[PDB]
From Swiss-Prot:
Deletion consequences: Mice are viable and fertile but display a loss of coordination of limb movement associated with disruptions of cortico-spinal tract. They also display altered development of the thymic epithelium which leads to a defective T-cells development.
Regions of this protein lying in the Cytoplasmic compartment: 1-262
Family according to the record: Belongs to the protein kinase superfamily. Tyr protein kinase family. Ephrin receptor subfamily.
Full protein stretch here: 609 to 891 of 986
Subunit structure: Heterotetramer upon binding of the ligand. The heterotetramer is composed of an ephrin dimer and a receptor dimer. Oligomerization is probably required to induce biological responses. Interacts (via PDZ motif) with SIPA1L1 (via PDZ domain); controls neuronal morphology through regulation of the RAP1 (RAP1A or RAP1B) and RAP2 (RAP2A, RAP2B or RAP2C) GTPases. Interacts with CDK5, CDK5R1 and NGEF; upon activation by EFNA1 induces NGEF phosphorylation by the kinase CDK5.
Active site: residue positions: 138
Subcellular location field: Cell membrane; Cell projection, Axon; Cell projection, Dendrite; Postsynaptic density membrane
Known tissue expression: Expressed in inner and outer pillar cells of the organ of Corti (at protein level). Highest expression in the adult brain and retina and also detectable in kidney, lung, skeletal muscle and thymus. Not detected in heart and liver. Expressed in myogenic progenitor cells.
Highest taxon above the source species: Eukaryota
Gene: Epha4
The protein's name in its UniProt record: Ephrin type-A receptor 4
Function field: Receptor tyrosine kinase which binds membrane-bound ephrin family ligands residing on adjacent cells, leading to contact-dependent bidirectional signaling into neighboring cells. The signaling pathway downstream of the receptor is referred to as forward signaling while the signaling pathway downstream of the ephrin ligand is referred to as reverse signaling. Highly promiscuous, it has the unique property among Eph receptors to bind and to be physiologically activated by both GPI-anchored ephrin-A and transmembrane ephrin-B ligands including EFNA1 and EFNB3.
Residues bound to ATP: 19-27, 45
UniProt domain comment: The protein kinase domain mediates interaction with NGEF.
Organism: Mus musculus (Mouse)
Amino acid sequence: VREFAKEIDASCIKIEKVIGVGEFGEVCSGRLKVPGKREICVAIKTLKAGYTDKQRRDFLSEASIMGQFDHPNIIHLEGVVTKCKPVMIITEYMENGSLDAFLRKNDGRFTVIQLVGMLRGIGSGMKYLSDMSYVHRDLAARNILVNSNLVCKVSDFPIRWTAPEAIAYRKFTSASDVWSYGIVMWEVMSYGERPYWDMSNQDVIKAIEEGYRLPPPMDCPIALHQLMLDCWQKERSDRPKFGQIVNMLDKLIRNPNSLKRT
């Protein structure tokens, strides 16, 4: 038994503005109002003009995947429009956009505890995904969305974010997602700096193989950096599982003096 995307009557949707474009099509912001329920803001993804039947199927499959998930740190699917043209995917609206862009616009504006809260949320969403045997493959701050309450949610259903065995052997697992998560931790604590800075992809691959790992971001707690290092263990089986990452973050949040050493 699988979940399926609810069909939304097109009359319940009001598109307000286009907010993003790409190869897939457009993303818009808008309102969803169904009879008897309060209006909410939504994101509306539309497939590019002139799409084929195959493109329509692949597009809606993203909705089918998303519809299997129900977790506060995974983007919520409101439904789809498939009875009318063009096809649309309707998801919860995330006021603050992508996490990488959000942090770069707010450099140094949050407390360590707020940043750790963001990471805990992402970790919780990834525990849920990995619990369901879903491997993301593209976990990065650009693929995390942020709401008005600073809640971070995994979306998007790249060499320097990728585990060395996934690059070298095409072995993608939740353990390679854990490597990526460590890079996301570094992005968060650095307010969206580019991992490995100006190093080229070839320089990154070689450095990682020789034992190089990213340093703590400026003023980053040593405990958080050690967790990054754990996520970047060379052997994938030595990395913490997402459940362990979340538990460690909960312990850091519960015992905030643990974050004092930098």
